[PDB]
Enzyme design. Structure first.
Site: not given
Ligand SMILES: N#CC[C@H](C1CCCC1)n1cc(-c2ncnc3[nH]ccc23)cn1
Length: 289
Positions: A40, A13, A15, A134, A17-19
């Site tokens: 996640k 669904l 990305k 964020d 980008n550590f997860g």
């Protein structure tokens, strides 16, 4: 509560980008009756990223609000390796994608409905002294045509008990075009820098995510597309210090642009509160209806 063996992968669904987040069916009875959930996981599970992920999980578990995506549980294989966060699945995707796909059928009153819901979710975060860090339409999810939820908390921090800001610098790419000037210059994050970013969210909504009108496209146009790497930040800082701002979106009324420009105050202490933002949005929405 959840066993990895019963999680059936369906698709990715998102990305970030550590997860990443996957759509899966949790089907412990193996008869295709289990519910579809969101999962996640870390993309590269260093010990530092795992400690951050555990804190993120505790933060989300501590939140219960109509406009915050619901925690369901955790899943891990091995002993405690392969930590996974289980959440409710929201079927309409991110608000960024939803808005773009339905721009011709979403009017200003509906945008302000979403805005008000975002402000209420953020005020609730603030009562727990959480700083989201964020806020952006890509991190807001659509549950149905009448309800959105803040959907990701991977950068969220708890304020120290004795301070009203949290100072942090991550390595790598930061969403600088949503950052308050004091986050760019001093790495200071606060409720007030969340309010700055919320102003950028409001901007995004009223641009209907038109490509050339995104904050990065607009700011890079204002600083010169010739600029690169480290100079981008430097010029952005100077641009904001000189009261350069994103333009009024096409069709956006003056009173809504004025909410944006008040959130974008260089003086941290003069930005409005999330309760006042919601009050003002709800008054404009009542007036329009
Ligand atoms: N919000 C947000 C962005 C987040 C991406 C950003 C970082 C990892 C994935 N993301 C979550 C989802 C998602 N989609 C559908 N239902 C969900 N429930 C919980 C998260 C989630 C899709 N992308």
């Amino acid at each position: 509560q959840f066993e990895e063996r019963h999680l059936k992968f369906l698709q990715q669904l998102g990305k970030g980008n550590f997860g990443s987040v996957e759509m899966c069916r949790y089907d412990p009875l193996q008869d295709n009756t289990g519910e579809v959930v969101a999962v996640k996981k870390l993309q590269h599970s260093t010990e530092e990223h795992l400690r951050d992920f555990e804190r993120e999980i505790e933060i989300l578990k501590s939140l219960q609000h109509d406009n915050i995506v619901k925690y369901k549980g955790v899943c891990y294989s091995a002993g405690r390796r392969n930590l996974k966060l289980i959440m409710e699945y929201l079927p309409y995707g991110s608000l960024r994608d939803y808005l773009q796909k339905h721009k011709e059928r979403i009017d200003h009153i509906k945008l302000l409905q979403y805005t008000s819901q975002i402000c209420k979710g953020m005020e609730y975060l603030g009562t727990k002294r959480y700083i989201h860090r964020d806020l952006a339409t890509r991190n807001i999810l659509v549950e149905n045509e009448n309800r959105v939820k803040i959907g990701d908390f991977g950068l969220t921090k708890v304020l120290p008990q004795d301070k009203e800001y949290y100072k942090v610098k991550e390595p790598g790419e930061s969403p600088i075009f949503w950052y308050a000037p004091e986050s760019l210059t001093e790495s200071k994050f606060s409720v007030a820098s969340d309010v700055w970013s919320f102003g950028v969210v409001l901007y995004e909504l009223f641009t209907y995510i038109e490509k050339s009108k995104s904050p990065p496209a607009e700011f890079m146009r204002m600083i010169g597309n010739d600029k690169q790497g480290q100079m981008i930040v430097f010029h952005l800082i100077e641009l904001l210090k000189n009261n350069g701002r994103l333009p009024r979106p096409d069709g956006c009324p003056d009173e809504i642009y004025m909410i944006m420009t008040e959130c974008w105050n260089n003086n941290v202490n003069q930005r409005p509160s999330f309760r006042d933002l919601a009050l003002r949005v709800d008054q404009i929405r009542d007036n329009m209806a």
